[PDB]
Amino acid sequence: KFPRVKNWELGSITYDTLCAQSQQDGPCTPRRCLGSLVLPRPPAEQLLSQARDFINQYYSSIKRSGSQAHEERLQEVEAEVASTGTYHLRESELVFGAKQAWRNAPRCVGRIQWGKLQVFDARDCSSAQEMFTYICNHIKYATNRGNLRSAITVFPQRAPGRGDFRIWNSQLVRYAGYRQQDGSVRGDPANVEITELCIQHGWTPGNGRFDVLPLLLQAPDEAPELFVLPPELVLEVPLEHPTLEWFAALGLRWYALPAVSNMLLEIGGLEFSAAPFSGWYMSTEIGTRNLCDPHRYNILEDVAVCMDLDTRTTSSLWKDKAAVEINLAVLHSFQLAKVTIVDHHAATVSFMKHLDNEQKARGGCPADWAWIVPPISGSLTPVFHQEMVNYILSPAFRYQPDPW
Amino acid sequence: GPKFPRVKNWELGSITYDTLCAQSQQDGPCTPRRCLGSLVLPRPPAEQLLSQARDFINQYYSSIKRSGSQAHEERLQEVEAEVASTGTYHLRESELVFGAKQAWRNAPRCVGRIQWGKLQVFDARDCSSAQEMFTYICNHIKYATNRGNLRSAITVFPQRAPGRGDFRIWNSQLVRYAGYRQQDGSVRGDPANVEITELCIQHGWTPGNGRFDVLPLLLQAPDEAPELFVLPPELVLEVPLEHPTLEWFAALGLRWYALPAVSNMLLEIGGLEFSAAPFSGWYMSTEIGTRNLCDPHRYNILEDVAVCMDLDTRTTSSLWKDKAAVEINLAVLHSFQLAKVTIVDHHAATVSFMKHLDNEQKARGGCPADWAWIVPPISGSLTPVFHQEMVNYILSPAFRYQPDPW
Ligand code: HEM
Ligand code: HEM
Ligand SMILES: N=C(NCCC[C@H](N)C(=O)N[C@H]1CN[C@H](C(N)=O)C1)N[N+](=O)[O-]
Ligand SMILES: N=C(NCCC[C@H](N)C(=O)N[C@H]1CN[C@H](C(N)=O)C1)N[N+](=O)[O-]
Ligand SMILES: C[C@H](O)[C@H](O)[C@H]1CNc2nc(N)[nH]c(=O)c2N1
Ligand SMILES: C[C@H](O)[C@H](O)[C@H]1CNc2nc(N)[nH]c(=O)c2N1
Ligand SMILES: [Zn+2]
Secondary structure, X not given: OOOEEEEOOOOOEXXXXXXXXXXXXXXXXXXXXXOOOOOOOOOHHHHHHHHHHHHHHHHHHOOOOOOHHHHHHHHHHHHHHHHHOOOOOOHHHHHHHHHHHHHOOOOOOOHHHOOOOEEEEOOOOOOHHHHHHHHHHXXXXXXXXXXXXXXXXXXXXXXXXXXXXXEOOOEOOOEOEEEOOOOOEEEOHHHHHHHHHHHHOOOOOOOOOOOEOOEEEEOOOOOOEEEOOOOOOOOEEXXXXXXXXXXXXXXXXXXXXXOEOOOEEEEOOEEEOOOOEEOOOEOHHHHHHHHHOOOOOOOHHHHHHHOOOOOOOHHHOHHHHHHHHXXXXXXXXXXXXXXXXXXXXXXXXXXXXXXXXXXXXXXXOEOOHHHHOOOOOXXXXXXHHEOOEEOOOOOEEEOOOOOO | OOOOOEEEEOOOOOEEEOOHHHXXXXXXXXXXXXXXXXXXXXXXXXXXXXXXXXXXXXXXXXXXXXXXXXXXXXXXXHHHHHHHHHOOOOOOHHHHHHHHHHHHHHOOOOOOHHHHHHOEEEEOOOOXXXXXXXXXXXXXXXXXXXXXXXXXXXXXXXXOOOOOOOXXXXXXXOOOEOEEEOOXXXXXXXXXXXXXXXXXXXXXXXXXXXXXXXOOEEEEOOOOOEEEEOOOOOOOOEEEOOOOOOOOHXXXXXXXXXXXXXOOOEEEXXXXXXXXXXXXXXXXXHHXXXXXXXOOOOOOOHHHHHHHOOOOOOOHXXXXXXHHHHHHHHHHHHHHHHOOOOOEOHHXXXXXXXXXXXXXXXXXXXXXXXXXXXXXXXXXXXXXXXXXXXXXXXXXXXXXXXXXXX
């Protein structure tokens, strides 16, 4: 019926009634739970109902529900869909839908911010070089000289028979992954495949550990085009430790803008295949996952040895000790270069709050517990002790197959 | 591709398919709509019992590789017969030892299952008094503690009988510290155990007033109220905590006992229900160092230790919490090793769980696991299980949560 959600630190309890608004289905069934899985796997009347629904959400949003503008706007969709098999959104609606899609992202812990979102309408894009410009402006704006501002740029919606506008990169900014001689990897290992694809389309490789990749933009039914980002637009932070003078000597650095760009944005039945978004980092994304994942830059042991720790046995907790300093380094550095960042403590505190604001406003909030809880010190944060319910609401950000 | 859940390990990029989940008879709390996987708690007539038992029986004979044999089909007859003429039935010695290990083996929340086949099953289905219950438990503790070289073990008391009252152990663990509710509102000792401390007092226990007073046991024989027994201190091995380099840590006077013994879980085998069947293994350092000692609603010693470390607990970005939490855990590890009591850190522990997964994959086609519970309270993505996806589902035999007997 309705799930009972309990917080074991405060002993408080709520009842998620929002989950009932879930139209789309998840991986789990009563026989078994697959919530820890990272990845998973729409005709005439389906669209119309998704559209009506979203238009209803829109007008309830501005309070002018069931009014005239609503009834008429509902006729516009009906008419357009019935004649062309599809329809279009209006700037204001698109702005509402985007914000909604972010508000419903179950894996996002920065949703307390869902209200302030700079929505750029790039639906009038007709070429990869045009895409490049939009993408470049997003960056200038979002970055704001280290004073980050969450933004999104929405490109032409998908269309039957025509190919999808796509940004081939995972994020607008990433470091190359050069699979070398001995099967080893120089740079960021999660970017080997994409770094090759760029070379293959005529990119002159590099030889560093932090070579900022070029963007492959794709306009409908046309092979992808290569564009280089103006070194100036791409802000970066040099990592140095507060008390460890020797840290900086590691040359570690990381870009300031986190901007996923391969996710599909779905609103009122429409699918936007290229709609990059960015807010700001949570220290642990850089210091824990990006730099300490064994299959990433995996610098855990180096910093360990540098700290003269006992890498001999696990029980010395060298890994833990080293991981904490690496995160501290990030927080210090970013805070030194006056670039927006939020540690996992402050961040989870705010999400905890967001769950409260949401409990009041919608009777619940979708959350993926395994993703909301930081990669280090989970139990030390309020979120670890909070039960969560996870379901799919729309508007929504979804995953989509790579364009190759 | 294969028509079973596809599981990926993102560190190694390897894949497997869980074909074992197909054996799950009991449905969980999730639905194709919403996932209730992060929740800790979410909630059998004659004819239904028979089928549960036939299932177990088949399971038994297969473990001894004799499915379809004479003993097997002759044993199934026996079970039907007995249930038919009495409404219930009994397990043979080795059938009990087999279910008890399958219960552990199936336990989706235990990261220590690699040891599943090494469990020591003490039968106690002959026990008939609360007093005797105390004797059994004392032996268990003595054997399991074994002076520090801990040994997996479980004592099984009489199974639920129609009408008659259950055998129960009121405490949540054979060994727990007292939770003294003060006047100002605070709690001296372990808040987790406030209710059980009040239940022991209401029953005649003369409380102390320490931060670590070992609770006495409230044992319950069928239909009788619970008798109150006090564990002899000599039996309850404990470990005083101290840091390997922070000389002042030993000054906090923090201590923890060596034996983790859950005792209020119902052990269910082939339909039968064993309301009192305490089991114990040994600690994973994070249980003490991060949960019991650092949780906000527990001892809550994070601020204290942070202050001792001269940390800036005024701002979060200083990571004072992450800093102290680490030293505390290290102190749990160090002190245990020093005192030669068995313990396993979250690194070794999780690594051994990956091995268990690889093993069980080849033996049964999968392994039911609760991600949120397998992944450690700290340093999560530094341990390999974080990077391992996993399927969760209920298999039987099993350990189930059960309502408090009051
Ligand atoms: C304002 C700052 C924000 C913070 C601190 C924040 C933080 C996070 C974090 C840490 C994650 C998980 C990251 C990972 O492990 O890959 C996440 C996921 C996500 N966030 Fe946010 N976020 C913010 C803004 C945004 C914005 C502007 C959007 C979209 C409009 C957004 C959409 C999402 C989505 C869709 C995911 C899930 C991505 C996936 O499934 O891989 N976030 N966010
Ligand atoms: C021998 C070493 C063992 C280790 C290191 C180990 C470790 C763990 C850990 C870390 C937990 C989670 C504790 C928590 O977060 O509350 C756990 C849960 C569990 N373990 Fe083990 N365990 C061991 C032995 C046993 C034994 C012998 C049994 C049973 C015969 C067992 C049954 C379970 C069960 C049922 C749970 C989950 C209980 C619940 O849901 O609250 N474990 N174990
Ligand atoms: N704070 C963030 N963080 C999102 C950063 C993305 C993350 N660092 C990343 O590399 N994402 C990849 C890898 N894992 C995701 C997946 N589902 O596989 C995509 N977002 N924002 O817009 O402000
Ligand atoms: N190592 C253990 N550990 C068991 C850990 C018990 C844990 N310290 C505890 O107090 N468990 C309670 C509180 N939370 C669980 C629940 N479901 O509410 C039970 N078991 N063993 O047999 O060796
Ligand atoms: C297998 C498991 O689902 C996977 O490793 C998840 C766990 N939690 C995560 N949490 C966040 N924020 N980001 C991730 O990429 C992951 N990976
Ligand atoms: C709310 C959430 O389910 C709860 O805090 C869980 C998370 N993971 C856990 N994992 C383990 N091993 N033990 C616990 O007690 C918990 N508590
Ligand atoms: Zn689930």
